[PDB]
Each structure stands twice: as C-alpha cells, then as structure tokens.
Design a protein around this ligand. Structure first.
Ligand SMILES: [Zn+2]
Ligand SMILES: [Zn+2]
Ligand SMILES: [Zn+2]
Ligand SMILES: [Zn+2]
Lengths: 156, 160, 167, 161
C-alpha cells in the first residue's frame, strides 16, 4: 500500500509525476486526512486576512508590554492586541456575560472587550489606531482583561 | 505531548513558552476533528455581511426571538423580528426546501409557501439589508405567517 | 448530552432553551465529521450573478431540479424534456464549475501523443478556466456554438465527469 | 445500507432524483466524510486564488522539477517559467514554518539572512504574486538560481520534520 505524500498532506505536492507517494485521498488512512484538513483550513483562513517577538507569542508580547520589559513598543502592543481579538469570538464572551449577575462590574468589561472584538473584525487597521489613542495605563488594563478572558475561555 | 487547547480553537498565541503540541501529525484524531470545527466557524464568520445582542435576546435565540414576536411577548420589536428572520434564512439552504417541494403533489398549497421561503432565502443571500426592509414592509399578520412557516420548515428539515 | 442536530448543520438558533450539546469537545467523531461537511457546503456556497442571466432561473423549476444538471444536459442532447439551448448552456457552466482542471490534466498525461482525446481534454480545460474567470461570458460563448458542436462538447464534458468520478 | 454517492464525495452530485446513492452525510461512513472534506477544501482554496508550464512535460516535472531543471539548465525551462514556478512554490510555503526554523539558528548564522530573504519573498507573493514574479525576473540568473535553490531546500526540509 502506497503511503500518503507528506507534501500533499500540507497542501499540494509539487513534484509532478516524479513523486511516488499516494496523492489519492481514497487510499489514505484517516489520520492523514485529518491532518491535511487542518493545514488546508489554516491556508484558507490566512488567505482572507523579529526573532524574539516570535518566541514570545502575542501573549508574551502583550504581557511584556504590561510589565514594560522585552522592549515592546506601544505600537507593537496594539497590533498584538488586534491579533488576540481576532483569536477570540464574541459568542464565547456573551456566554460568560450571561453567567454574571446584574450590575456585576465584570459585565462592563465583557461588553468593552466584545465591542473591541467587533471593531476589529470590521476594520483591524483602525481598531489598532483606537487602541494606540488610549492612555498607556488604560490600554494595559484592557489588554490584561482580554488576556484573562482568553485564558479563561480556553480552560472551560 | 498533548494537543494545545489554544491551538484546538485556532492559533495558540503563547509562542515558545507553550509546551503543548502544535504539531498536527502527533495529535489524536478527536482533537483534529474539534479544531476543524472551530476553524470552519471562523472561516464562515470571516466572510459574513444590535438590539438582539442584549442579554435576554441572546438566551432566547433567533428562534426564541421569532416565536416571541409571534406571540407578542418578551418585548420583541418588529424590527428585531425582521433581522432575526434574516439570520434564520441564512441558516437555511434552498436545496433542502426544493427537496421538500419535490415531495408535494401539484397544486398543494405547501408548494406556494416553499417557493415564497425559497425566494426569501435568495433575496437574503444577495442582500440581507434590503431583505430585512421588505420583511418590515409586510403587514404584521402576514409577516408572522411567513415567520411561522419558515420556522416550521427549519424544524422539519432538521428532524429528517 | 447528545449533539444538537441544529448545530450539526451549522448554528443552533434556540439560545439557552436548547438542551442539546453545543460543545464540540464532547461530541462523538461522526457528528463532528457530518458538521464539517454541512459547513464546507455553506462556505463554498457563500463565495459563489448567474440567476440574473437569461435561461438560469429556469432550471430551478420543479422538474429541472429533479433532472439535475446532468439530466438537463443529457435531455438537451436528446432534445427531450423541453430544455432550451439557453438552459443547457447555463447547466454547462454549473458542470464546469464542479470539475477541476487538475483532474483533467492528470487524464491527459495518461494519453499517448497525438491521441485525439488530448485535443478534447484541452478544450474542456480551457472551458473550465473561462468559466472560473467569468461564467457569464463562458455561457455566451457556449450559446454562440452551433447546436451540433455544443452537444458534442457537452457530451465529452459529461463523459469526463463520469470518468473521473469512477477512478 | 446505501453507499455514499461518489460524485458527492467530490463535491455535489449532479444527477438529481435519478441517483440512487446516499447523499445524506448522517449515514455515510467516516472515511468518505474525510475524503469529501479534502476535495471540498481544495475547491474552496482554488476558488479564492489570484500558461507555458501547463504543457505536458512541465506538468510531469512539477514546480519542483521545473525549478530544479531551470537550475541545471535542462528541459528547456525559460527563465520566465522558472519565476512563475517560484511563485507557485512560495504560495505553498508558509512564513510561520520558516520563522520556526530561524528560531533554531544561533545569532549571526548566515542561514538567518536567507530565511528572512525567503520570508520576505513569501510575503511579497501573498500581497501581489504578479509583481513578485517581475522582481524575480529582474534578478541576475546566478542569484535567482541561488534563491530558488534555498527555497527548495527549505521546502524539502520543513516537509521532513
Ligand atoms: Zn507527492
Ligand atoms: Zn500552545
Ligand atoms: Zn442546540
Ligand atoms: Zn449521487
């Protein structure tokens, strides 16, 4: 039985006839089929959109900007903020807002984040401007909340 | 290594600090299935064209809102009803209706309604902003009829 | 909790009332598979001017639906079920869309040089490409063809379509 | 039990009521469901995409074959065709995987220069592949071939770990 072409697993094998691995999904085992869909989804999504800031992550960058370390400019923070908002989805926040009792101050912040997520989906270029207009101390508050929600959602 | 739960929902944002797997080849299948679902949802949201965001219109659902507007409860304005109608139409697909219309014998009155819903679904895909205008122009009693039929189809399709 | 069948087809719209699972992590794999298929269909539909062009709104009608695009096209060839030449050309467009050049190129590679099949493969391929660029005019082109040659082309395209799908 | 319609497996069955195979995902077995997603993903991707190397032997070569051939000046690969194929390769690559490799390098490793060069090419290419191909044509043959060779090496490298 021919094994699945690992190039095709990540998308499209580019070796033409030379390549002697399977490119025929019908004979692939399921796990390879699963993995490919993940790479292909990643590509689809990308399509409709420095060394230590990479190793930090968007979270690392943002946490660093808060503690004023690793030389994170406020501009870079705002951009990273945009990337974080994109990774979040309003519906998960709304779900959390529903668990809160009225006039809980958490509800104010949930709605603030939610409105940011929505500005960001419409036009991330200006959402980033907005975020830059904020005074440092309030931007950091917001970032810290967004991060906390982000962590929160992901562990339940 | 277990799969990064952040990555399962999309893209882990912790850089090198995160010590969970981000390598799809070593994930077990179930996680791979789940991630595709979150990612599909994102892709779809991403190519999409304010009252019913509010706390109780969220817990109602679009169906709840619409059923409430029909029975004149939970304070659902006619505007909010029309918007929700748009969200419902979006969730439906013409082909499933056409399949139902084919089971009907000629001059069955059901066929009229199926085609009405179908044309609404199509107006909606073209331009939901005006489809919602249209829907607002309807007299309350006929809008509610339409909504009710659309809801019945929606339920019907989903259980077979 | 079992998976919400509404969510299986996309997005459950019943809010808090609905007592079925909407949490992918607890769904069994088969439901997860099925949902991806409905969602893919929606995504694709969502990035698709046609039903404005003459002859197209026509084949939504009750029997042109039961025929299929293939049925319509095979009917136009045998001059039955009242298929206008306009409707044929539109259906042709829908068929071309369903095909992908790469699968044809793969077949062309199995042919030995100067095999006449290679000419027809390339004709279909070029049609597929006109169609992806601008299906509105591809349909015009197809209408300009003399009936007897259009029917030839349709027949070849259909044969490829069948051929690909069974290997 | 009805088997899954093989036409539907590749997308949308076009035979209407005549077709007696299942088109109901709920009764399909999982493997068919997996296969269909792959064909449908391919279609979706093709659908949001922005002539020489369609020809019979440039197809059997692949984009890699074309590029490797242009480097060794064989199989009659024009420099124009090389540049286009380069674009197709860049598209198949993703910056993030390169960044991951650049992180494994120690500072001032010359590899880092090349990783960033490729990365910036990938990004020009995603923005506007038409001009990325112009750029690539402006390069002197000997440097274009260097770049192509590096890109190919990365491409192979990523794919085997
Ligand atoms: Zn291969
Ligand atoms: Zn992680
Ligand atoms: Zn539900
Ligand atoms: Zn079928």
């Amino acid at each position: 039985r021919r094994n699945p072409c690992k190039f095709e697993i990540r998308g499209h094998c580019l070796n033409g006839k030379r390549c002697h691995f399977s490119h025929n999904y019908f004979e692939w085992p399921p796990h390879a089929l699963l993995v490919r869909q993940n790479f292909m989804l990643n590509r689809i999504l990308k399509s409709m959109d420095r060394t230590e800031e990479y190793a930090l992550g968007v979270v690392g960058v943002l946490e660093s900007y808060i503690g004023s370390i690793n030389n994170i400019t406020k501009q870079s923070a705002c951009v990273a903020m945009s990337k974080l908002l994109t990774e979040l989805n309003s519906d998960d926040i709304k779900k959390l807002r529903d668990n809160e009792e009225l006039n809980s101050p958490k509800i104010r912040v949930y709605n603030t984040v939610i409105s940011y997520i929505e500005s960001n989906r419409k036009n991330n270029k200006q959402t980033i401007h907005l975020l830059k207009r904020l005074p440092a101390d309030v931007l950091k508050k917001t970032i810290k909340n967004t991060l906390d929600i982000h962590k929160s959602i992901t562990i339940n």
